[PDB]
Design an enzyme around this catalytic site. Sequence first.
Site, PDB file in Angstrom:
ATOM      1  N   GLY A  44     -10.133   2.231  11.192  1.00 33.57           N
ATOM      2  CA  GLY A  44      -8.871   2.560  10.447  1.00 33.57           C
ATOM      3  C   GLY A  44      -9.126   3.368   9.665  1.00 33.57           C
ATOM      4  N   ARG A  45      -7.984   3.945   9.036  1.00 32.93           N
ATOM      5  CA  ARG A  45      -8.022   4.834   7.968  1.00 32.93           C
ATOM      6  C   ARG A  45      -6.697   4.539   6.997  1.00 32.93           C
ATOM      7  NH1 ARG A  45      -8.972  10.672   9.423  1.00 32.93           N
ATOM      8  NH2 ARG A  45      -6.668  11.386   9.999  1.00 32.93           N
ATOM      9  N   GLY A  46      -7.158   4.672   5.639  1.00 31.99           N
ATOM     10  CA  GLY A  46      -5.988   4.400   4.712  1.00 31.99           C
ATOM     11  C   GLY A  46      -5.966   5.467   3.811  1.00 31.99           C
ATOM     12  N   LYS A  47      -4.952   5.714   2.804  1.00 33.06           N
ATOM     13  CA  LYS A  47      -4.798   6.621   2.040  1.00 33.06           C
ATOM     14  C   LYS A  47      -6.109   6.959   1.117  1.00 33.06           C
ATOM     15  CE  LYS A  47      -1.861   5.218  -1.216  1.00 33.06           C
ATOM     16  NZ  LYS A  47      -0.663   4.505  -1.842  1.00 33.06           N
ATOM     17  N   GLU A  50     -11.746   5.639   4.936  1.00 36.46           N
ATOM     18  CA  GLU A  50     -12.051   5.323   6.305  1.00 36.46           C
ATOM     19  C   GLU A  50     -12.924   4.206   6.646  1.00 36.46           C
ATOM     20  OE1 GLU A  50     -13.068   8.813   8.485  1.00 36.46           O
ATOM     21  OE2 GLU A  50     -11.059   9.100   8.913  1.00 36.46           O
ATOM     22  N   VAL A  51     -12.652   3.369   7.401  1.00 37.29           N
ATOM     23  CA  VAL A  51     -13.373   2.060   7.513  1.00 37.29           C
ATOM     24  C   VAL A  51     -13.788   1.976   8.941  1.00 37.29           C
ATOM     25  CG1 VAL A  51     -13.328  -0.472   7.702  1.00 37.29           C
ATOM     26  CG2 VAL A  51     -11.685   1.050   5.811  1.00 37.29           C
ATOM     27  N   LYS A  66     -16.872   1.417   4.181  1.00 38.24           N
ATOM     28  CA  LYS A  66     -15.693   2.067   3.697  1.00 38.24           C
ATOM     29  C   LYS A  66     -16.101   3.186   3.048  1.00 38.24           C
ATOM     30  CE  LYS A  66     -12.061   0.974   0.524  1.00 38.24           C
ATOM     31  NZ  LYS A  66     -11.476  -0.247  -0.344  1.00 38.24           N
ATOM     32  N   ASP A 154      -2.918  -5.933  -4.827  1.00 36.89           N
ATOM     33  CA  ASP A 154      -2.594  -5.775  -3.379  1.00 36.89           C
ATOM     34  C   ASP A 154      -2.785  -6.771  -2.635  1.00 36.89           C
ATOM     35  OD1 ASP A 154      -1.616  -3.777  -1.511  1.00 36.89           O
ATOM     36  OD2 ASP A 154      -3.662  -3.076  -1.258  1.00 36.89           O
TER      37      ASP A 154
END
Length: 327
Positions: A44-47, A50-51, A66, A154
Amino acid sequence: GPVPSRARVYTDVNTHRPREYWDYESHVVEWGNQDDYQLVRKLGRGKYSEVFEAINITNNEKVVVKILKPVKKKKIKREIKILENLRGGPNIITLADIVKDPVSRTPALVFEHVNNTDFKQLYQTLTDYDIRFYMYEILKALDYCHSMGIMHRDVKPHNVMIDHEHRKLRLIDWGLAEFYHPGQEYNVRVASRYFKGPELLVDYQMYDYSLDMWSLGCMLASMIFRKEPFFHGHDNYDQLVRIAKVLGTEDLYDYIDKYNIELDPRFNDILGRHSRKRWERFVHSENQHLVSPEALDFLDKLLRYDHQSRLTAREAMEHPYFYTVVK
Ligand SMILES: O=C(O)c1ccc2c(c1)nc(Nc1cccc(C(F)(F)F)c1)c1nc(NC3CC3)ncc12
Protein backbone atom coordinates in the site's frame (compact mmCIF):
# COMPACT_ATOMS: atom_id res chain seq x y z
CA GLY A 1 -4.56 33.02 27.06
CA PRO A 2 -5.12 29.28 27.55
CA VAL A 3 -4.39 27.61 30.88
CA PRO A 4 -1.35 25.30 30.78
CA SER A 5 -1.57 21.52 31.25
CA ARG A 6 0.86 18.74 32.26
CA ALA A 7 0.70 14.96 31.95
CA ARG A 8 -0.36 13.42 35.26
CA VAL A 9 2.12 10.56 34.79
CA TYR A 10 5.56 10.12 33.24
CA THR A 11 5.71 13.90 33.28
CA ASP A 12 9.48 14.25 33.45
CA VAL A 13 10.70 11.03 31.84
CA ASN A 14 12.56 12.91 29.09
CA THR A 15 13.63 15.69 31.45
CA HIS A 16 15.90 13.15 33.13
CA ARG A 17 16.95 11.03 30.15
CA PRO A 18 20.28 11.77 28.48
CA ARG A 19 19.90 14.42 25.77
CA GLU A 20 20.75 11.84 23.07
CA TYR A 21 17.55 10.00 24.03
CA TRP A 22 15.08 12.69 22.93
CA ASP A 23 17.21 15.06 20.82
CA TYR A 24 16.38 13.19 17.61
CA GLU A 25 17.59 16.00 15.36
CA SER A 26 21.18 15.05 16.22
CA HIS A 27 20.60 11.31 15.75
CA VAL A 28 23.13 9.66 13.45
CA VAL A 29 21.48 6.91 11.43
CA GLU A 30 23.25 3.54 11.25
CA TRP A 31 22.70 2.19 7.72
CA GLY A 32 22.31 -1.46 6.81
CA ASN A 33 22.87 -3.12 3.44
CA GLN A 34 20.17 -2.28 0.93
CA ASP A 35 21.01 -5.47 -0.99
CA ASP A 36 19.84 -7.60 1.96
CA TYR A 37 16.20 -6.98 1.04
CA GLN A 38 14.32 -7.97 -2.09
CA LEU A 39 10.91 -6.35 -2.65
CA VAL A 40 8.13 -8.89 -3.30
CA ARG A 41 4.94 -6.84 -3.60
CA LYS A 42 3.48 -3.42 -2.85
CA LEU A 43 1.12 -3.61 0.13
CA GLY A 44 0.00 0.00 0.00
CA ARG A 45 0.74 3.69 -0.09
CA GLY A 46 0.29 6.40 2.52
CA LYS A 47 0.70 10.16 2.41
CA TYR A 48 4.20 9.65 3.78
CA SER A 49 5.44 6.34 2.38
CA GLU A 50 4.95 3.20 0.34
CA VAL A 51 5.00 -0.15 2.10
CA PHE A 52 6.25 -3.38 0.52
CA GLU A 53 6.36 -7.01 1.54
CA ALA A 54 9.92 -8.23 1.11
CA ILE A 55 12.33 -11.03 1.86
CA ASN A 56 15.49 -10.62 3.88
CA ILE A 57 17.80 -12.79 1.78
CA THR A 58 20.30 -13.21 4.64
CA ASN A 59 17.78 -15.37 6.54
CA ASN A 60 15.05 -15.90 3.93
CA GLU A 61 12.63 -14.30 6.41
CA LYS A 62 9.66 -12.24 5.32
CA VAL A 63 9.85 -8.56 6.28
CA VAL A 64 8.15 -5.28 5.45
CA VAL A 65 9.82 -2.26 3.89
CA LYS A 66 8.55 1.28 4.35
CA ILE A 67 10.11 3.57 1.74
CA LEU A 68 9.63 7.08 3.06
CA LYS A 69 8.30 9.68 0.66
CA PRO A 70 10.44 12.83 0.58
CA VAL A 71 7.46 14.26 2.44
CA LYS A 72 9.05 16.20 5.32
CA LYS A 73 12.51 16.23 6.85
CA LYS A 74 13.59 15.80 10.49
CA LYS A 75 10.35 13.87 10.84
CA ILE A 76 12.44 11.01 9.47
CA LYS A 77 14.93 11.09 12.33
CA ARG A 78 12.08 11.47 14.83
CA GLU A 79 10.41 8.26 13.70
CA ILE A 80 13.74 6.42 13.55
CA LYS A 81 14.85 7.53 17.03
CA ILE A 82 11.48 6.65 18.53
CA LEU A 83 11.54 3.18 16.93
CA GLU A 84 15.04 2.62 18.29
CA ASN A 85 14.16 3.88 21.78
CA LEU A 86 11.12 1.60 21.96
CA ARG A 87 12.61 -1.47 20.29
CA GLY A 88 12.03 -4.69 22.19
CA GLY A 89 9.22 -3.15 24.24
CA PRO A 90 5.98 -5.12 24.71
CA ASN A 91 3.94 -5.23 21.49
CA ILE A 92 5.97 -2.49 19.77
CA ILE A 93 6.74 -3.21 16.11
CA THR A 94 10.41 -4.09 15.66
CA LEU A 95 12.52 -1.97 13.37
CA ALA A 96 14.94 -4.53 11.97
CA ASP A 97 17.07 -2.27 9.80
CA ILE A 98 17.28 1.02 7.92
CA VAL A 99 18.69 1.20 4.40
CA LYS A 100 19.01 3.88 1.72
CA ASP A 101 16.67 3.13 -1.15
CA PRO A 102 18.58 3.87 -4.38
CA VAL A 103 15.43 4.59 -6.40
CA SER A 104 13.53 6.86 -4.00
CA ARG A 105 16.74 8.44 -2.69
CA THR A 106 15.17 8.26 0.78
CA PRO A 107 15.48 6.01 3.83
CA ALA A 108 13.68 2.69 3.79
CA LEU A 109 12.68 1.29 7.18
CA VAL A 110 12.61 -2.50 7.48
CA PHE A 111 10.12 -3.92 10.01
CA GLU A 112 9.23 -7.33 11.33
CA HIS A 113 6.47 -8.94 9.29
CA VAL A 114 3.13 -9.55 11.01
CA ASN A 115 0.79 -12.16 9.54
CA ASN A 116 -2.27 -10.09 10.44
CA THR A 117 -5.97 -10.14 9.61
CA ASP A 118 -7.08 -6.70 8.40
CA PHE A 119 -9.32 -4.95 10.91
CA LYS A 120 -12.02 -4.72 8.24
CA GLN A 121 -12.36 -8.53 8.41
CA LEU A 122 -11.22 -9.14 11.99
CA TYR A 123 -13.46 -6.84 14.02
CA GLN A 124 -16.69 -8.57 13.03
CA THR A 125 -15.33 -11.93 14.21
CA LEU A 126 -13.94 -10.82 17.60
CA THR A 127 -15.61 -12.29 20.66
CA ASP A 128 -16.09 -10.55 24.00
CA TYR A 129 -13.01 -12.38 25.24
CA ASP A 130 -10.92 -11.40 22.19
CA ILE A 131 -11.76 -7.70 22.66
CA ARG A 132 -10.65 -7.65 26.29
CA PHE A 133 -7.55 -9.68 25.45
CA TYR A 134 -6.40 -7.45 22.60
CA MET A 135 -7.31 -4.25 24.46
CA TYR A 136 -5.03 -5.39 27.27
CA GLU A 137 -2.31 -6.07 24.71
CA ILE A 138 -2.66 -2.55 23.26
CA LEU A 139 -2.46 -1.14 26.78
CA LYS A 140 0.88 -2.91 27.30
CA ALA A 141 2.22 -1.16 24.21
CA LEU A 142 0.77 2.20 25.27
CA ASP A 143 1.96 2.09 28.86
CA TYR A 144 5.39 1.15 27.53
CA CYS A 145 5.75 4.05 25.09
CA HIS A 146 4.24 6.53 27.58
CA SER A 147 6.62 5.27 30.30
CA MET A 148 9.37 5.89 27.77
CA GLY A 149 8.34 9.51 27.20
CA ILE A 150 6.59 9.02 23.88
CA MET A 151 3.06 9.55 22.61
CA HIS A 152 1.91 7.62 19.56
CA ARG A 153 -0.69 10.19 18.34
CA ASP A 154 -2.16 7.94 15.64
CA VAL A 155 -3.80 5.07 17.49
CA LYS A 156 -6.46 3.56 15.19
CA PRO A 157 -7.47 0.07 13.96
CA HIS A 158 -5.12 0.17 10.96
CA ASN A 159 -2.10 0.78 13.22
CA VAL A 160 -2.78 -2.13 15.55
CA MET A 161 -1.70 -5.24 13.68
CA ILE A 162 -3.08 -8.52 14.97
CA ASP A 163 -2.01 -12.05 14.16
CA HIS A 164 -5.21 -13.75 15.25
CA GLU A 165 -3.66 -17.22 14.84
CA HIS A 166 -0.93 -16.77 17.45
CA ARG A 167 -2.85 -14.11 19.37
CA LYS A 168 -0.02 -11.63 18.76
CA LEU A 169 -0.35 -7.84 18.52
CA ARG A 170 1.93 -5.04 17.28
CA LEU A 171 1.45 -1.26 17.43
CA ILE A 172 2.84 0.18 14.18
CA ASP A 173 3.44 3.43 12.26
CA TRP A 174 5.28 5.68 14.70
CA GLY A 175 5.52 8.33 12.00
CA LEU A 176 3.36 10.76 13.97
CA ALA A 177 4.82 9.84 17.38
CA GLU A 178 6.47 12.56 19.50
CA PHE A 179 8.48 12.98 22.69
CA TYR A 180 6.52 14.42 25.63
CA HIS A 181 8.13 17.47 27.21
CA PRO A 182 6.24 19.26 30.00
CA GLY A 183 4.87 22.58 28.74
CA GLN A 184 5.57 21.89 25.09
CA GLU A 185 2.93 22.93 22.55
CA TYR A 186 2.28 20.32 19.84
CA ASN A 187 0.73 20.32 16.37
CA VAL A 188 -2.99 19.50 16.60
CA ARG A 189 -2.99 18.02 13.08
CA VAL A 190 -2.31 14.45 14.17
CA ALA A 191 -4.42 11.26 14.36
CA SER A 192 -7.12 10.14 11.94
CA ARG A 193 -10.31 12.21 12.07
CA TYR A 194 -12.45 9.61 13.89
CA PHE A 195 -9.82 9.16 16.60
CA LYS A 196 -8.83 12.80 17.22
CA GLY A 197 -9.18 13.80 20.88
CA PRO A 198 -11.34 16.78 21.86
CA GLU A 199 -8.06 18.57 22.65
CA LEU A 200 -7.12 18.49 18.96
CA LEU A 201 -10.64 19.42 17.87
CA VAL A 202 -10.67 22.52 20.07
CA ASP A 203 -7.14 23.46 19.00
CA TYR A 204 -5.48 22.95 22.42
CA GLN A 205 -1.77 22.34 21.84
CA MET A 206 -0.39 21.47 25.30
CA TYR A 207 -1.64 17.88 25.24
CA ASP A 208 0.06 14.63 26.28
CA TYR A 209 -0.06 10.82 26.39
CA SER A 210 -3.74 11.06 27.30
CA LEU A 211 -4.54 11.77 23.61
CA ASP A 212 -3.79 8.08 22.88
CA MET A 213 -6.31 7.08 25.53
CA TRP A 214 -9.13 8.97 23.80
CA SER A 215 -8.17 7.20 20.55
CA LEU A 216 -8.20 3.85 22.33
CA GLY A 217 -11.64 4.63 23.74
CA CYS A 218 -12.87 5.33 20.20
CA MET A 219 -11.53 1.91 19.13
CA LEU A 220 -13.17 0.22 22.13
CA ALA A 221 -16.54 1.85 21.41
CA SER A 222 -16.38 0.69 17.77
CA MET A 223 -15.59 -2.88 18.83
CA ILE A 224 -18.05 -3.43 21.71
CA PHE A 225 -20.87 -1.62 19.88
CA ARG A 226 -20.02 -2.93 16.41
CA LYS A 227 -19.99 0.51 14.80
CA GLU A 228 -16.72 1.38 13.04
CA PRO A 229 -15.87 4.11 13.35
CA PHE A 230 -17.96 5.11 16.37
CA PHE A 231 -17.76 8.90 16.02
CA HIS A 232 -18.22 9.19 12.26
CA GLY A 233 -17.67 12.88 11.47
CA HIS A 234 -17.74 14.31 7.95
CA ASP A 235 -14.99 16.81 8.78
CA ASN A 236 -13.13 18.00 11.91
CA TYR A 237 -15.96 20.32 12.95
CA ASP A 238 -18.68 17.73 12.54
CA GLN A 239 -16.36 15.34 14.38
CA LEU A 240 -16.68 17.49 17.52
CA VAL A 241 -20.46 17.74 17.04
CA ARG A 242 -20.70 13.93 16.82
CA ILE A 243 -18.80 13.66 20.08
CA ALA A 244 -20.90 16.38 21.75
CA LYS A 245 -24.11 14.50 20.81
CA VAL A 246 -22.94 11.68 23.11
CA LEU A 247 -20.89 13.33 25.86
CA GLY A 248 -23.09 16.42 25.78
CA THR A 249 -22.43 20.09 25.26
CA GLU A 250 -22.40 21.24 28.90
CA ASP A 251 -19.33 19.14 29.68
CA LEU A 252 -17.68 20.37 26.49
CA TYR A 253 -18.17 23.90 27.77
CA ASP A 254 -16.82 22.88 31.19
CA TYR A 255 -13.73 21.51 29.40
CA ILE A 256 -12.93 24.55 27.29
CA ASP A 257 -13.79 26.79 30.26
CA LYS A 258 -11.36 24.93 32.51
CA TYR A 259 -8.50 25.62 30.08
CA ASN A 260 -9.79 29.09 29.18
CA ILE A 261 -10.09 27.94 25.54
CA GLU A 262 -12.49 29.53 23.08
CA LEU A 263 -14.41 27.39 20.58
CA ASP A 264 -14.09 28.30 16.90
CA PRO A 265 -17.07 30.62 16.32
CA ARG A 266 -18.09 28.45 13.37
CA PHE A 267 -19.53 26.06 15.98
CA ASN A 268 -22.16 28.71 16.81
CA ASP A 269 -24.45 27.51 14.01
CA ILE A 270 -23.73 23.77 14.15
CA LEU A 271 -23.13 22.64 17.75
CA GLY A 272 -26.61 22.91 19.29
CA ARG A 273 -27.47 21.81 22.84
CA HIS A 274 -27.14 18.15 23.78
CA SER A 275 -27.55 16.19 26.97
CA ARG A 276 -24.92 13.66 27.99
CA LYS A 277 -26.14 10.19 26.97
CA ARG A 278 -25.99 6.92 28.90
CA TRP A 279 -23.93 4.26 27.13
CA GLU A 280 -26.73 1.71 27.29
CA ARG A 281 -28.54 3.40 24.40
CA PHE A 282 -25.88 2.06 22.00
CA VAL A 283 -26.50 -1.53 23.10
CA HIS A 284 -28.74 -3.70 20.93
CA SER A 285 -29.43 -7.37 20.23
CA GLU A 286 -26.53 -7.64 17.76
CA ASN A 287 -23.79 -6.28 20.04
CA GLN A 288 -25.02 -7.09 23.59
CA HIS A 289 -22.79 -10.17 23.83
CA LEU A 290 -19.80 -7.77 23.64
CA VAL A 291 -21.13 -5.44 26.33
CA SER A 292 -20.96 -5.75 30.08
CA PRO A 293 -21.22 -3.26 32.93
CA GLU A 294 -17.41 -3.51 33.16
CA ALA A 295 -16.97 -2.60 29.47
CA LEU A 296 -19.30 0.40 29.75
CA ASP A 297 -17.57 1.72 32.85
CA PHE A 298 -14.14 1.27 31.26
CA LEU A 299 -15.21 3.01 28.05
CA ASP A 300 -16.83 5.78 30.09
CA LYS A 301 -13.51 6.36 31.85
CA LEU A 302 -11.52 6.60 28.59
CA LEU A 303 -13.90 8.91 26.72
CA ARG A 304 -13.65 12.11 28.78
CA TYR A 305 -13.43 15.58 27.20
CA ASP A 306 -10.84 16.57 29.82
CA HIS A 307 -7.61 14.82 28.83
CA GLN A 308 -6.46 15.10 32.45
CA SER A 309 -9.51 13.08 33.59
CA ARG A 310 -8.93 10.06 31.35
CA LEU A 311 -7.61 6.76 32.69
CA THR A 312 -3.88 6.37 32.14
CA ALA A 313 -2.70 3.22 30.39
CA ARG A 314 -1.49 1.77 33.69
CA GLU A 315 -4.78 2.57 35.48
CA ALA A 316 -6.66 1.13 32.53
CA MET A 317 -4.80 -2.15 33.01
CA GLU A 318 -6.12 -2.25 36.59
CA HIS A 319 -9.76 -2.05 35.44
CA PRO A 320 -12.28 -4.82 36.31
CA TYR A 321 -12.95 -5.22 32.55
CA PHE A 322 -9.67 -7.15 32.37
CA TYR A 323 -10.26 -9.47 35.33
CA THR A 324 -11.53 -12.18 32.97
CA VAL A 325 -8.42 -11.98 30.75
CA VAL A 326 -5.87 -14.71 31.47
CA LYS A 327 -2.53 -13.36 32.69
O1 LIG B 1 4.66 2.07 9.42
C1 LIG B 1 5.09 1.09 10.07
O2 LIG B 1 5.61 1.19 11.21
C2 LIG B 1 4.69 -0.31 9.62
C3 LIG B 1 5.21 -1.42 10.28
C4 LIG B 1 4.82 -2.70 9.90
C5 LIG B 1 3.88 -2.87 8.87
C6 LIG B 1 3.34 -1.76 8.23
C7 LIG B 1 3.74 -0.49 8.62
N1 LIG B 1 2.42 -1.92 7.24
C8 LIG B 1 2.04 -3.14 6.80
N2 LIG B 1 1.05 -3.39 5.93
C9 LIG B 1 0.36 -2.54 5.16
C10 LIG B 1 -0.63 -3.09 4.35
C11 LIG B 1 -1.44 -2.28 3.57
C12 LIG B 1 -1.15 -0.92 3.48
C13 LIG B 1 -0.11 -0.37 4.22
C14 LIG B 1 0.18 1.13 4.10
F1 LIG B 1 0.92 1.56 5.11
F2 LIG B 1 -0.96 1.80 4.07
F3 LIG B 1 0.84 1.33 2.97
C15 LIG B 1 0.66 -1.18 5.04
C16 LIG B 1 2.54 -4.26 7.45
N3 LIG B 1 2.12 -5.47 7.07
C17 LIG B 1 2.61 -6.57 7.66
N4 LIG B 1 2.17 -7.74 7.22
C18 LIG B 1 1.19 -7.75 6.13
C19 LIG B 1 0.54 -9.11 5.88
C20 LIG B 1 1.59 -8.55 4.90
N5 LIG B 1 3.53 -6.48 8.65
C21 LIG B 1 3.96 -5.30 9.07
C22 LIG B 1 3.47 -4.14 8.48
